[PDB]
Amino acid sequence: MVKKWECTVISNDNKATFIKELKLAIPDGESVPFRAGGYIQIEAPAHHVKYADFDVPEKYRGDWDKFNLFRYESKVDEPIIRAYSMANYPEEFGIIMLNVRIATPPPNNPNVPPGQMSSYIWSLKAGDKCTISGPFGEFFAKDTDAEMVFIGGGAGMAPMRSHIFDQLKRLKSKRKMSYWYGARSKREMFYVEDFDGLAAENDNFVWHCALSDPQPEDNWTGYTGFIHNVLYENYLKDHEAPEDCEYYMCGPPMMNAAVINMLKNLGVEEENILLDDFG
Ligand SMILES: Cc1cc2nc3c(=O)[nH]c(=O)nc-3n(C[C@H](O)[C@H](O)[C@H](O)COP(=O)(O)OP(=O)(O)OC[C@H]3O[C@@H](n4cnc5c(N)ncnc54)[C@H](O)[C@@H]3O)c2cc1C
Ligand SMILES: NC(=O)C1=CN([C@@H]2O[C@H](COP(=O)(O)OP(=O)(O)OC[C@H]3O[C@@H](n4cnc5c(N)ncnc54)[C@H](O)[C@@H]3O)[C@@H](O)[C@H]2O)C=CC1
Ligand SMILES: NC(=O)C1=CN([C@@H]2O[C@H](COP(=O)(O)OP(=O)(O)OC[C@H]3O[C@@H](n4cnc5c(N)ncnc54)[C@H](O)[C@@H]3O)[C@@H](O)[C@H]2O)C=CC1
Ligand code: NA
Ligand code: NA
Structure with missing residues (x-):
């Protein structure tokens, strides 16, 4: 049933201004037995990260500078957990790929805390550990011939x-x-x-x-x-x-x-x- 994997981050590159593709290697090259549309949970320990330490490539930094997003910090004093959908399909074996939006504070409320788990995920670099659990899901394809x-x-x-x-x-x-x-x-x-x-x-x-x-x-x-x-x-x-x-x-x-x-x-x-x- 519910299994947990302590994964190793392969890469965590921006795909858009505000989306990172988190790629995770499953231990022992095993595969998560998920269904397309399904999700895992990521958990994280208490921690403190700074947006200034994020690796945001030049080509994506424009709106980060414009809205002074590197000002932000996230200090989380309790364990946290969140769900993220798989971007890989089940026969992309041995990995889990996620597309994670950075949940910055809203513009009209710029001084409330940043999103806890997305700030943590955006802090991860190659070689870091990331613990996931699952798989879970309900957003599954129908088994029909319909367009x-x-x-x-x-x-x-x-x-x-x-x-x-x-x-x-x-x-x-x-x-x-x-x-x-x-x-x-x-x-x-x-x-x-x-x-x-x-x-x-x-x-x-x-x-x-x-x-x-x-x-x-x-x-x-x-x-x-x-x-x-x-x-x-x-x-x-x-x-x-x-x-x-x-x-x-x-x-x-x-x-x-x-x-x-x-x-x-x-x-x-x-x-x-x-x-x-x-x-
Ligand atoms: C089944 C499922 C699949 C999902 N798949 C994806 C996916 O593929 N990609 C993805 O990016 N997300 C996905 N999510 C969403 C994800 O689980 C998180 O909800 C998301 O990453 C935001 O969580 P967070 O901890 O970063 O932000 P939170 O800490 O939950 O904060 C959310 C927002 O509230 C703001 N906020 C904080 N305090 C206040 C306040 N006082 N007033 C106003 N605003 C405030 C924060 O700044 C932030 O913008 C999925 C969720 C589910 C349930
Ligand atoms: N499945 C979900 O519940 C998802 C929720 N979100 C949330 O939505 C908000 C915006 O997310 P972003 O990724 O920045 O999206 P975005 O602002 O980049 O918008 C993406 C696309 O959505 C469509 N769209 C946006 N606003 C619309 C509107 N008013 N009317 C019709 N179509 C519209 C447009 O085609 C736009 O190109 C965030 O709060 C994000 O958390 C985003 C993606 C998936
Ligand atoms: N984390 C995210 O997904 C963020 C998304 N954005 C989006 O980028 C686009 C910016 O539009 P532009 O034409 O470049 O400029 P603009 O100044 O015309 O942007 C318009 C809106 O951006 C909104 N905005 C959203 N998140 C904001 C943030 N963290 N700080 C400040 N403003 C924020 C403001 O409400 C403003 O009304 C908007 O669609 C905004 O939603 C901007 C910042 C963070
Ligand atoms: Na892109
Ligand atoms: Na075609």
Whole structure:
């Protein structure tokens, strides 16, 4: 049942301004027996970390400097635990990959404490230990032949990647599949080579990214605006049977609400709407 692993951090690089990909090596090269969409728990001891010690690459530091985010510190005097979704799929053996947003204090409340566990995770470097437990889960794919529409935003990426690779690689699915991902700007995109490669290799999979706040330096000529509107205008509006698809979503609360509203207005039933709310 519930097992615990004292893992070793392989890498903990930024994938976006405010997202790190934590890669963990499982002891003895064993694999966590998880399902795509599932999660583990990370636990951490009492500790004290400083944002100034974070490894944030130059290309991502712009908004860190703009909003003086390196000011922050997190002192935690009790053990803590949190859930994080796997970004790897089950046959990426011997590892656990996470996509962790740094939960800074809100702008209108800049002096409340920073997020406890995400600050701790962003402190980790290669060779550090990280204890996880699980696996757990409920955000699982349905076992049908229905067309799948995956809708991700921001820091909701991880279960989308896990799901999509699980279908196309482990299950060798022939189901029609698409992924619609909303990012603020081009530097906030990630897993581009992974999804481009899957799309190129699988005639039943395509993906699209929309930028809601494209930046002058992005030279962006792709889709813009909120991902739900892009998905509607460029695919679902013309679809002959949107109610016949299964929708799997993980994104900001406002994205989830806009998506659900749009789908219900197309006649999609709740049975066909699955989402993972991180709380
Ligand atoms: C099943 C599941 C899967 C998940 N998967 C992911 C995932 O893939 N990636 C991911 O990034 N997260 C994921 N989460 C969320 C994750 O578990 C944490 O909730 C998240 O990392 C924030 O926790 P934290 O300890 O860093 O912040 P907390 O310490 O819980 O704080 C949250 C926020 O509250 C703010 N805050 C603190 N005090 C105050 C105050 N007085 N007034 C106002 N605001 C205040 C903090 O600054 C911070 O912004 C998942 C959650 C679940 C349940
Ligand atoms: N940890 C995170 O996920 C953070 C995300 N951001 C996001 O970056 C974008 C910044 O937009 P820009 O066009 O560059 O500038 P801007 O000044 O126009 O940003 C607009 C909003 O950024 C918000 N913001 C969110 N987190 C903030 C933080 N920690 N400190 C200060 N302001 C914060 C403020 O409410 C402001 O209203 C916003 O989308 C903001 O939400 C910014 C800071 C941290
Ligand atoms: N599954 C969950 O519960 C998740 C929750 N979040 C939370 O959502 C907030 C924003 O997270 P970020 O990763 O910085 O996202 P973000 O601010 O970078 O937004 C990501 C994408 O979401 C869509 N979106 C954002 N605001 C929207 C709105 N008002 N209407 C419609 N679509 C919108 C856009 O397509 C945007 O590109 C944070 O508080 C984060 O904790 C984020 C991701 C997943
Ligand atoms: Na990026
Ligand atoms: Na394709």
